Amino acid sequence: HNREPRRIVIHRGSTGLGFNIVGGEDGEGIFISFILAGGPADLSGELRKGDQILSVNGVDLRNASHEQAAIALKNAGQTVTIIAQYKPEEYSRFEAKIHDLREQLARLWETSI
Numbered sequence: 001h002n003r004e005p006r007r008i009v010i011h012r013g014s015t016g017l018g019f020n021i022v023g024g025e026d027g028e029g030i031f032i033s034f035i036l037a038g039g040p041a042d043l044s045g046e047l048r049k050g051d052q053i054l055s056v057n058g059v060d061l062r063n064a065s066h067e068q069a070a071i072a073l074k075n076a077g078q079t080v081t082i083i084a085q086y087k088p089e090e091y092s093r094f095e096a097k098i099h100d101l102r103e104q105l106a107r108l109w110e111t112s113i
Protein backbone atom coordinates (compact mmCIF):
# COMPACT_ATOMS: atom_id res chain seq x y z
CA HIS A 1 0.00 0.00 0.00
CA ASN A 2 1.25 3.61 -0.67
CA ARG A 3 2.08 5.08 2.82
CA GLU A 4 3.22 8.50 1.51
CA PRO A 5 0.81 11.47 1.66
CA ARG A 6 -1.61 11.46 -1.33
CA ARG A 7 -3.48 14.43 -2.88
CA ILE A 8 -7.09 13.32 -3.53
CA VAL A 9 -9.78 15.46 -5.17
CA ILE A 10 -13.42 14.52 -4.50
CA HIS A 11 -16.20 16.09 -6.56
CA ARG A 12 -19.57 16.00 -4.82
CA GLY A 13 -22.96 17.59 -5.48
CA SER A 14 -25.10 18.89 -2.57
CA THR A 15 -24.54 15.80 -0.32
CA GLY A 16 -22.03 14.69 2.33
CA LEU A 17 -18.68 13.19 1.35
CA GLY A 18 -19.93 9.78 2.68
CA PHE A 19 -17.26 8.87 5.24
CA ASN A 20 -16.89 8.92 9.04
CA ILE A 21 -14.02 10.39 11.11
CA VAL A 22 -12.65 9.50 14.55
CA GLY A 23 -9.82 11.20 16.52
CA GLY A 24 -9.00 14.74 17.69
CA GLU A 25 -6.98 14.05 20.87
CA ASP A 26 -3.59 15.84 21.00
CA GLY A 27 -1.00 13.84 18.93
CA GLU A 28 -3.78 11.53 17.63
CA GLY A 29 -4.97 13.16 14.37
CA ILE A 30 -8.19 12.60 12.36
CA PHE A 31 -8.80 9.16 10.74
CA ILE A 32 -11.38 7.66 8.36
CA SER A 33 -13.32 5.02 10.38
CA PHE A 34 -15.84 4.11 7.66
CA ILE A 35 -16.59 4.69 3.93
CA LEU A 36 -20.29 4.67 2.94
CA ALA A 37 -20.85 2.44 -0.17
CA GLY A 38 -22.17 4.63 -3.07
CA GLY A 39 -21.13 7.96 -1.43
CA PRO A 40 -18.74 10.42 -3.17
CA ALA A 41 -15.65 9.24 -1.21
CA ASP A 42 -16.42 5.57 -2.09
CA LEU A 43 -17.15 6.30 -5.79
CA SER A 44 -13.81 8.10 -6.07
CA GLY A 45 -12.07 4.87 -4.88
CA GLU A 46 -9.10 6.89 -3.48
CA LEU A 47 -9.81 7.11 0.31
CA ARG A 48 -9.76 4.15 2.73
CA LYS A 49 -10.58 3.29 6.33
CA GLY A 50 -7.32 3.95 8.28
CA ASP A 51 -6.37 7.01 6.20
CA GLN A 52 -5.32 10.00 8.32
CA ILE A 53 -6.73 13.27 6.95
CA LEU A 54 -3.76 15.69 6.93
CA SER A 55 -5.47 18.60 5.14
CA VAL A 56 -8.80 19.59 3.54
CA ASN A 57 -8.94 22.59 1.14
CA GLY A 58 -5.58 23.80 2.57
CA VAL A 59 -6.66 23.60 6.25
CA ASP A 60 -4.16 21.53 8.25
CA LEU A 61 -6.03 18.89 10.36
CA ARG A 62 -2.99 16.88 11.54
CA ASN A 63 -3.59 17.95 15.20
CA ALA A 64 -7.21 19.26 14.79
CA SER A 65 -9.85 18.63 17.48
CA HIS A 66 -12.73 16.32 16.37
CA GLU A 67 -15.09 19.38 16.08
CA GLN A 68 -12.54 21.45 14.08
CA ALA A 69 -12.13 18.54 11.62
CA ALA A 70 -15.91 17.90 11.30
CA ILE A 71 -16.62 21.60 10.54
CA ALA A 72 -13.69 21.94 8.01
CA LEU A 73 -14.83 18.78 6.13
CA LYS A 74 -18.59 19.67 6.16
CA ASN A 75 -17.91 23.25 4.91
CA ALA A 76 -15.35 22.20 2.16
CA GLY A 77 -17.72 22.89 -0.82
CA GLN A 78 -18.16 20.76 -3.99
CA THR A 79 -14.48 20.34 -5.02
CA VAL A 80 -12.67 18.87 -1.98
CA THR A 81 -8.86 18.58 -2.08
CA ILE A 82 -7.70 16.21 0.70
CA ILE A 83 -4.14 15.25 1.65
CA ALA A 84 -4.51 11.73 3.15
CA GLN A 85 -1.91 9.28 4.49
CA TYR A 86 -2.67 5.55 4.98
CA LYS A 87 -1.64 4.66 8.59
CA PRO A 88 -3.44 1.40 9.50
CA GLU A 89 -1.05 0.68 12.48
CA GLU A 90 -2.03 4.07 14.01
CA TYR A 91 -5.71 3.40 13.05
CA SER A 92 -5.71 0.04 14.96
CA ARG A 93 -5.28 2.13 18.20
CA PHE A 94 -8.97 3.24 17.75
CA GLU A 95 -10.06 -0.43 17.38
CA ALA A 96 -7.90 -1.16 20.55
CA LYS A 97 -9.95 1.47 22.51
CA ILE A 98 -13.12 -0.64 22.04
CA HIS A 99 -11.28 -4.02 22.34
CA ASP A 100 -9.37 -2.99 25.55
CA LEU A 101 -12.72 -1.75 27.06
CA ARG A 102 -14.81 -4.96 26.26
CA GLU A 103 -11.81 -6.97 27.71
CA GLN A 104 -11.27 -4.72 30.88
CA LEU A 105 -15.07 -5.43 31.42
CA ALA A 106 -18.72 0.44 23.43
CA ARG A 107 -18.68 3.07 20.59
CA LEU A 108 -16.02 5.54 19.36
CA TRP A 109 -16.82 9.30 19.22
CA GLU A 110 -17.50 9.44 15.42
CA THR A 111 -18.97 12.03 12.96
CA SER A 112 -20.43 11.32 9.47
CA ILE A 113 -19.11 13.81 6.82
Ligand SMILES: C[N+](C)(C)CCO
Pocket residue numbers: 070109110111112
Ligand atom coordinates in the same frame (compact mmCIF):
# COMPACT_ATOMS: atom_id res chain seq x y z
C1 LIG B 1 -21.90 13.98 18.47
N1 LIG B 1 -21.22 13.09 17.47
C2 LIG B 1 -19.76 13.11 17.64
C3 LIG B 1 -21.64 11.72 17.65
C4 LIG B 1 -21.57 13.46 16.08
C5 LIG B 1 -21.23 14.89 15.65
O1 LIG B 1 -19.84 15.41 15.77
Ligand SMILES: [Cl-]
Pocket residue numbers: 007081
Ligand atom coordinates in the same frame (compact mmCIF):
# COMPACT_ATOMS: atom_id res chain seq x y z
CL1 LIG C 1 -2.17 20.79 -3.05
